[PDB]
Amino acid sequence: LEIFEYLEKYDYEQVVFCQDKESGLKAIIAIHDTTLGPALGGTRMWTYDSEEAAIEDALRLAKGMTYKNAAAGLNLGGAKTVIIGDPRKDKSEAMFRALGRYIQGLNGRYITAEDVGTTVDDMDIIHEETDFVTGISPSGNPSPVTAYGVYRGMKAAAKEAVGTDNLEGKVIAVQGVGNVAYHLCKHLHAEGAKLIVTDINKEAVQRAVEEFGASAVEPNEIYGVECDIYAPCALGATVNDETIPQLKAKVIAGSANNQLKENRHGDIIHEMGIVYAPDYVINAGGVINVADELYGYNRERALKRVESIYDTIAKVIEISKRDGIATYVAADRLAEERIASLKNSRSTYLRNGHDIISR
């Protein structure tokens, strides 16, 4: 529990322990940076090994969002809530009214939304207490936008590796047929590309073959498949010392988070001629979407900021050459350079300054 030492290391702002005995709520709202504006980050509700793990998670994820929101061109800092709970058992109206009030008693420093373990019905209760909450569908599926996001990511990667942003003829190995993966396939299919798929659900793989004339490989095998592009759209740590030498594709580009199992994995991929579209730059679609909800939802302008994931990857790719460093590093430096440059250009005084909260 060396909290302050860790906080001072990556210069976190606040870790806000919230408790309401009536409900049983035990939430850690962790806020890494608010340089660009309010911190945005969903409420994850999972059971934990130990309280220490739940704190380390909140912090990990929050520092994450700082960089996602940065690169995604949002005016939002990094935060995340972790409730300690079994979503299937430990939820109540109280618990979300409780947390709602605590969020309102940060008065726009933190804006939540759904994550692992939380429903929109959940956020709909939080909304009873505050408007510092997004992903309210009653006001739908973020899934197709995250996917459209990856499609645009994939292209810029293809153009660097393969020589054209056209995906016609190209053979795409899609790990997992989730909601995000399915809609990704949809675009990939209808742009003249051939899909090899796999999933822990077989029914889902049959949906894919049936719809997109696709090939079906076993979970274990997806890595060694002869193809041009590997799209991890399942779990993370899918790019490790086991999978990387197995890998035939010259482009990685998926929806999954923490594609790289350690930081030294992305380093060898670079030196291997593989072109990695970094996780948190591509799946930015989902955040960019709920983020546009706050301005007041506009389908066109939303998808145009997502459209731009192409140009974000393109710059990350460029910098990875201009500085000879793995794409995930260029991405970190891209976000950093942005946060920093704005911090200067906007340090001019105004008594009526504008932000996403003044909508």
- The residue within the footprint of its own copies, chosen from 94, 171, 217, 268 (CB under 8 A), is 94
Under rule CB under 8 A, residue 119 binds its own copies: no
Smallest gap from Cβ 50 to its own copies, in A, equals 9
Integer angstrom CA distances of residue 297 from 146, 175, 300: 16, 31, 9
Of the candidates 281, 222, 280, the residue with the CA atom closest to the CA atom of residue 249: 222
Backbone dihedral angles phi then psi of residue 58, each to the nearest 5 degrees: -40, -50
Residue whose CB is less far from its own copies, 19 or 141? 19
How many residues belong to the chain? 359
Under rule CB under 8 A, residue 310 binds its own copies: no
CA separation for the pair 330, 13 (Å, rounded): 24
Under rule CB under 8 A, residue 289 binds its own copies: no
Under rule CB under 8 A, residue 347 binds its own copies: yes
Under rule CB under 8 A, residue 345 binds its own copies: yes
Integer angstrom CA distances of residue 108 from 5, 16, 78, 105, 111: 26, 14, 13, 8, 6
- The residue within the footprint of its own copies, chosen from 46, 47, 60, 104 (CB under 8 A), is 104
- The residue within the footprint of its own copies, chosen from 304, 311, 322, 323 (CB under 8 A), is 304
Judge whether 292 and 301 are in contact, CB under 8 Å.
yes
Under rule CB under 8 A, residue 66 binds its own copies: no
Judge whether 83 and 25 are in contact, CB under 8 Å.
yes
Under rule CB under 8 A, residue 95 binds its own copies: yes
Under rule CB under 8 A, residue 73 binds its own copies: yes
Under rule CB under 8 A, residue 200 binds its own copies: no
Angle between the 51-71 and 327-345 helix axes, to the nearest 10 degrees? Answer: 70
Number of residues located near its own copies, criterion CB under 8 A: 77
- Selected catalytic residue, list 68, 80, 159, 194: 80
Stretch that binds its own copies, among 11-19, 159-167, 179-187, 193-201 (CB under 8 A): 11-19
- Give me the 238-277 binding string for its own copies, x by CB under 8 A, dash otherwise: ----------------------------------------
Smallest gap from Cβ 22 to its own copies, in A, equals 4
- Give me the 142-161 binding string for its own copies, x by CB under 8 A, dash otherwise: --------------------
- The residue within the footprint of its own copies, chosen from 35, 43, 134, 146 (CB under 8 A), is 35
Kindly give the residue spans of alpha helices, DSSP state H, lying in 190-283. 202-212, 263-271, 279-282
Asked whether the CA dihedral 48, 34, 285, 295 is positive or negative, the reply is: positive
Residue whose CB is less far from its own copies, 85 or 232? 85
- After which residues is the backbone of the chain broken at C–N > 2.5 Å? 139
Q: Which tokens go with 247?
A: 């890998």
Q: Which amino acid does the sequence have at 331?
A: A
Of the candidates 99, 116, 165, 157, the residue with the CA atom closest to the CA atom of residue 275: 157
Under rule CB under 8 A, residue 190 binds its own copies: no
Region label for 121, one of left (φ > 0), alpha (ψ between -120 and 50) or beta (otherwise): alpha
Q: Is 80 a catalytic residue?
A: yes
Smallest gap from Cβ 151 to its own copies, in A, equals 21
Stretch that binds its own copies, among 3-11, 228-236, 250-258, 268-276 (CB under 8 A): 3-11
Under rule CB under 8 A, residue 301 binds its own copies: yes
Under rule CB under 8 A, residue 215 binds its own copies: no
Under rule CB under 8 A, residue 235 binds its own copies: no
Under rule CB under 8 A, residue 353 binds its own copies: yes
- Residue 19's H or E segment, with its range, is strand 14-20
For residue 121, the tally of other CB atoms under 10 A from its CB is: 12
Under rule CB under 8 A, residue 17 binds its own copies: yes
Under rule CB under 8 A, residue 298 binds its own copies: yes
The residues assigned a catalytic role are: 80
